[PDB]
Amino acid sequence: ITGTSTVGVGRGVLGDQKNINTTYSTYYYLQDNTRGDGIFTYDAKYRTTLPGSLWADADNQFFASYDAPAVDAHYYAGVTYDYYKNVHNRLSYDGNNAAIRSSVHYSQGYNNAFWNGSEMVYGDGDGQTFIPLSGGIDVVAHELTHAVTDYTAGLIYQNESGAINEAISDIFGTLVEFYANKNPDWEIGEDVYTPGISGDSLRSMSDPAKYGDPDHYSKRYTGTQDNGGVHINSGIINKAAYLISQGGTHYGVSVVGIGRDKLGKIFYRALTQYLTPTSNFSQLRAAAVQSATDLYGSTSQEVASVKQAFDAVGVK
Numbered sequence: 001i002t003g004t005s006t007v008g009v010g011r012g013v014l015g016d017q018k019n020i021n022t023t024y025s026t027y028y029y030l031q032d033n034t035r036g037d038g039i040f041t042y043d044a045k046y047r048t049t050l051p052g053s054l055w056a057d058a059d060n061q062f063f064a065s066y067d068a069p070a071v072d073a074h075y076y077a078g079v080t081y082d083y084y085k086n087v088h089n090r091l092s093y094d095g096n097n098a099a100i101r102s103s104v105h106y107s108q109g110y111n112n113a114f115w116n117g118s119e120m121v122y123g124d125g126d127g128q129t130f131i132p133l134s135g136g137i138d139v140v141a142h143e144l145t146h147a148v149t150d151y152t153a154g155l156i157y158q159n160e161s162g163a164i165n166e167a168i169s170d171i172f173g174t175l176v177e178f179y180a181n182k183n184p185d186w187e188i189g190e191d192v193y194t195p196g197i198s199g200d201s202l203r204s205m206s207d208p209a210k211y212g213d214p215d216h217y218s219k220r221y222t223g224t225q226d227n228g229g230v231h232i233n234s235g236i237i238n239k240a241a242y243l244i245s246q247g248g249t250h251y252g253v254s255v256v257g258i259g260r261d262k263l264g265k266i267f268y269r270a271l272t273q274y275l276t277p278t279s280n281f282s283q284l285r286a287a288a289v290q291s292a293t294d295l296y297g298s299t300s301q302e303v304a305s306v307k308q309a310f311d312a313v314g315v316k
């Protein structure tokens with residue numbers, strides 16, 4: 001829309017009030033002109049045609065139950081944009097301020113969210129396994145990170161390359177959650193998963209085995225389900241990232257932690273300079289070692305800790 005930038009107010013999926021950047025031209029649209037070439041949020045109206053209609057509102061107030069997933073998709077896309085710009089000097093997912101588009105209310109009872117090659121897409125959940133998935137800042141940032149990966153390393157979404165793809169999205173989703181600094185943790189999807197059960201999540205980076213995922217290369221899945229286990233074997237890499245940041249001893253191997261900020265620098269460099277569409281876990285180790293060497297020096301603690309972390313998860 002061509003109009004004037006405005007600031008609306010609404011409530012997200014978890015019932016929290018937030019301001020959102022909108023545009024006015026007869027209606028107020030979920031179009032944020034303050035970031036890049038815009039952030040645009042669409043209504044898929046419980047159908048699967050995409051993107052659907054650019055979200056329009058008569059009064060710039062977004063407090064209806066139907067509005068909540070749009071409010072959060074739109075707001076958390078802005079947070080994720082800010083993280084990549086402020087922390088990594090990256091302008092949108094293509095590095096040239098590409099428009100960021102999301103659709104909410106996708107299908108009926110849809111227990112998932114995804115990047116479809118052109119935009120983010122969020123289901124409302126069935127109210128039992130999930131509530132609307134855009135309520136999770138880690139979920140929104142996970143999806144937008146798939147766009148970043150597709151424009152950079154382009155990790156093929158199958159087998160070991162696909163597991164790295166998934167782990168990169170869990171890592172940056174978590175780092176974005178810590179950047180926004182509201183109830184941050186190393187779990188994925190806890191804000192929107194199983195409303196009737198407290199304390200669980202979809203996956204854990206700190207303890208992948210908690211939710212049945214491998215935390216060592218010896219326990220990797222090698223069958224064909226889930227594109228050869230992309231959301232399963234991501235646990236091996238998620239654990240290595242957790243260890244690089246936080247430290248710990250895992251199967252007897254001790255890792256000196258170096259903190260989230262350096263974890264983010266090392267993985268962002270690996271993703272944008274060293275990883276390729278066919279990279280496997282061993283090649284990820286080399287890419288992370290080279291990135292840490294570039295940033296901190298071959299004799300640094302940071303390099304030593306990357307090696308320790310990959311050793312701890314059985315990746316040579």
Ligand SMILES: [Ca+2]
Binds near residue numbers: 057058060061063
């Ligand atoms: Ca309204």
Ligand SMILES: [Ca+2]
Binds near residue numbers: 183
């Ligand atoms: Ca959290």
Ligand SMILES: [Ca+2]
Binds near residue numbers: 174190
């Ligand atoms: Ca989380």
Ligand SMILES: [Ca+2]
Binds near residue numbers: 197198199200201
């Ligand atoms: Ca739950």
Ligand SMILES: [Ca+2]
Binds near residue numbers: 202211212213
């Ligand atoms: Ca599981």
Ligand SMILES: [Ca+2]
């Ligand atoms: Ca090829």
Ligand SMILES: [Zn+2]
Binds near residue numbers: 142146166169
């Ligand atoms: Zn993913």
